[PDB]
Amino acid sequence: MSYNYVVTAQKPTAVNGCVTGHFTSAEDLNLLIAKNTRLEIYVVTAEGLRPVKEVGMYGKIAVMELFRPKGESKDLLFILTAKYNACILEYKQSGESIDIITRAHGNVQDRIGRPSETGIIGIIDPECRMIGLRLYDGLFKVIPLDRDNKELKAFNIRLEELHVIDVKFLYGCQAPTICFVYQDPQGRHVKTYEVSLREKEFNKGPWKQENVEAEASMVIAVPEPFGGAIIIGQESITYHNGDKYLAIAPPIIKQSTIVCHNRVDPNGSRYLLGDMEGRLFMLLLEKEEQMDGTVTLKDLRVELLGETSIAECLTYLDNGVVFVGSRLGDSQLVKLNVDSNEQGSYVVAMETFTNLGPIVDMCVVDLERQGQGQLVTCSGAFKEGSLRIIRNIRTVPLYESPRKICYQEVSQCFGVLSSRIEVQDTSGGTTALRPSASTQALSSSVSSSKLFSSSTAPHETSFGEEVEVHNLLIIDQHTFEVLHAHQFLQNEYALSLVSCKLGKDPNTYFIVGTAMVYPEEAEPKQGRIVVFQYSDGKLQTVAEKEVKGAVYSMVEFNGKLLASINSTVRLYEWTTEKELRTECNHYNNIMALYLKTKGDFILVGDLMRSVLLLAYKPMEGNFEEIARDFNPNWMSAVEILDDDNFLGAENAFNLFVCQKDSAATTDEERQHLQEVGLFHLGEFVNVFCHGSLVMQNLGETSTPTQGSVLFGTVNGMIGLVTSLSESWYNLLLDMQNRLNKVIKSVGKIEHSFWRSFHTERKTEPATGFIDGDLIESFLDISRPKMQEVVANLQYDDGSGMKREATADDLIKVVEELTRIH
């Protein structure tokens, strides 16, 4: 038995969707934003954005599109989830009560069917004839938009083109027509089909197969005035319409791939394009009246507007205001000006919505209060990379990618691993793209070692190729200025980082694990463990130990250094000569990627969820394997809850908990960790960390929860996991089952189905976990429904009774729960 509780401390901040329309009322303009499981609804005003409504769904929002059927006042919202929950929602408001009622819903998953390589693709007919879904290769699912179709009954159509890249619904066609780019052994081609709902099949398209460029990746349907479609690849942008086929290869777009678009003018005269590196261009379609009124396309033009955040999605609001939704960095509201500025940019930032972005590492530090903790995270990537100090948000921009972070109280500063991309120069060296933290440092230094300077492989890098330089930044804990930046060797990749005191030495060092990464060398055969000391504003190399592999992880192990070099878990001692001395080795069947420790227990793991539990035998002086559990599945992070329980995150955004059976009968069962917890979290965990963001409370007053483990995810969501008792767990489980009956789910998605452990192979129900969000939602509902929940419910307020539970006893319990984060 597990008994665990998980709650959201910070909602997902990364924006993955954004669409404009008339969702609330046909008059005012609305902007809908999709942050994974959250949906935000704003009204577009002349000043900025007016928050109207925020809702949460029981599923990851994959598709989100607005559409107004024939004979409807305002627009409806179609949403598909990762678990293939489709639904049509409508905005309804009565006086001052806002509710997103579910007009239709249903699951559109197909038992058997290979998911496509380009992921789920959802489109809707311009005249709302149907909803076309591309979920599995070789099949095209169709949901007919009829007033009778309430369950969303859909049918598949045989698709001869297996490898479909992008697909859209065309404008101005007699019958609903789809246009899509696909790839076969002869290259990529754009093709059209006519979807017949009567025949329930495909028919010849207006203009069938046409050859496109090799990297053709994006398809855009042009509205009625123009018609046809626009195919965007890596080097060229083409427009196709029946007989005419115009193409331009502007050099201004060659340096990066365009990955997102959005329509400016409703007639299709202008479009916004965003590339991977944040660049924002304007694609213009010139008109040609042709006198009688046929309006044909004359020419195509691309004009670089400027630079924004790395845009996942774009949407033009109005009056030159553009919303940039970002996954790697903060979201933006930017203004487009006509005359540009002195630098030449036509874009001007307006608002910066904080996005914790991909939290790759984090730590908890007391800092100021000397009582409650604060959370420092490495967020963002590339020029969006930064540090975030969350209090119970302070941003420190780095303009390069942060990887690992650790705090050193002795020196009152943090040590952070980071990497910056540079490009091979004609002279032979490398040149930076932009001034980042590693370059704009007060003190600087480079690793001048002799281990690999003489032991190096012969090779050369061509001009233009990108190479990342790794650095260790020493950053003040108060001002957060880059005090020092130490650059590592060429072709050296820094993986692990710790700050601790080793052996009798009273000094606190920064220990970094590295690995020599060469292109021709698949698995690393060289690496270093470098022990630095920061003092007097400078970082000096105290010790250097070479290793025959990659130092994936390191942990402080009872005054000794526990490192992982490929398959080996090694244990070093800090000699009086200030050098690392090998004391123990343990060779495993897996790659020691994840390394955690608790006292004398060591938890080892690899990328395929191969959990291993070892123990250091002090009297013998060697390692001993206690147990293991090998179930193939992609694992992202792991952590040790207590002496017997171990928490981890595996594929499909799932959390699991294994347990060590101690004092059993058979050695066989003793050496096996039983899977005692499964729970679909919906987030991709990248780092677990013991700690809490609330006041630890001096006077111990019987805490209901034991333990505290925060975790950071890719969508910026921060979560907290804790342990419960069997009584509390059973009570909260019954209470969840009771809440599900009275609570109203957006899209009418079953909570049981949402939180159930799910992978493409097996999908089991959730166990050993308490959804803290569902439990804490009890305080935000009406009192009659609270009474419904506690109806015929027995509660224990302390030893005796065992009495009829009131809504307010449970309110007290839930308010106590809400004080853990």
């Binding site: 790659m591 395929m608 992609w634 499909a652 493409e760 192979r761």
Partner: protein, 396 residues
Amino acid sequence: INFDTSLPTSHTYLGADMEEFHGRTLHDDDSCQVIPVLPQVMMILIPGQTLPLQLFHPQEVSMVRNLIQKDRTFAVLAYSNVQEREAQFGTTAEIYAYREEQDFGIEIVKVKAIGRQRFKVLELRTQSDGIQQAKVQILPECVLPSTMSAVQLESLNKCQIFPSKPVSREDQCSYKWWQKYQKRKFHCANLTSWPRWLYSLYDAETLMDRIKKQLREWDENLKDDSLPSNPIDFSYRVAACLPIDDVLRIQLLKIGSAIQRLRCELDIMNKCTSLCCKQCQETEITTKNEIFSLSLCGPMAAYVNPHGYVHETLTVYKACNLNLIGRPSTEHSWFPGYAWTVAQCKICASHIGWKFTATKKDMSPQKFWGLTRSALLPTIPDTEDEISPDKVILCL
């Protein structure tokens, strides 16, 4: 290098053309089945591997008739202890060819089957007839999505597809294209807490091409056609022709993920460089540098002798510490055009295999060695520097 790699797979030594079937039988995953086992079969069958058999015993002939009339599937037990007939896993075999002949007044049956599904043995139950059944649980093939499939950004989904393969030996052997492949496929590695080269070690296609680079060292047939593209089929086809002992093969059969199977096969191909005598454990017979493919299946394939014994023969160029017994003969030669001579270990006299010598001067190779897998033992090479003996433990 002009034999004809299509000759060994035909098993022309078995006689006239056999009656062939086109139907296929597959049981549901995790389902329970009761399948008959052939008494004298001692091989460890791998899915996709061809198994030829000559049955003389009346019990075996009757059982094979009954099978030909039913689903044509029998169970090949992977024996951990062959003496006491212990088995925890196994593979199903589907008869796809048979010939029922009454020769010189005795009735015999020749069969060509192929491995289908792995299974866990739940019960071994020998009827009063002397023929036994197996209560069995079909083991499912674990197919995992791309390690990047979860973290891949929606904007970058359209960019994951690559524009065809170079399939030019020099262009693909040049690591520039693989630098490009790693940069493109594992870009979203920046979102996670690990780099790209890590995920490359768990990538089906990367591992499959690393294995292709080793298989080209054994055969000059291009991957364009001969090798499969599916990771399951590729992993099984590689496992079928790896000269390892029965315990390693059992451990490899226990793997359910194609990723782990490909990784273990790469690790075996890189570590075990020597092949010694299993009885000696120390007498070296050959090395992986001499392994070469004389058949389309690869360097190693199963063949049946005139008396029904099955030998997984591995074809190598050179071999040492072997004494030849008798004189060459072409009778029932598994390689038409070559004559075989019994080969024993110089130390222990274990039948290690045979020495095949061409019958025509124009044939190439003029001589090679066919070693039976049951008599070989994979071995790591003693380090050139004795002071450096790093651990070479089995890795997967």
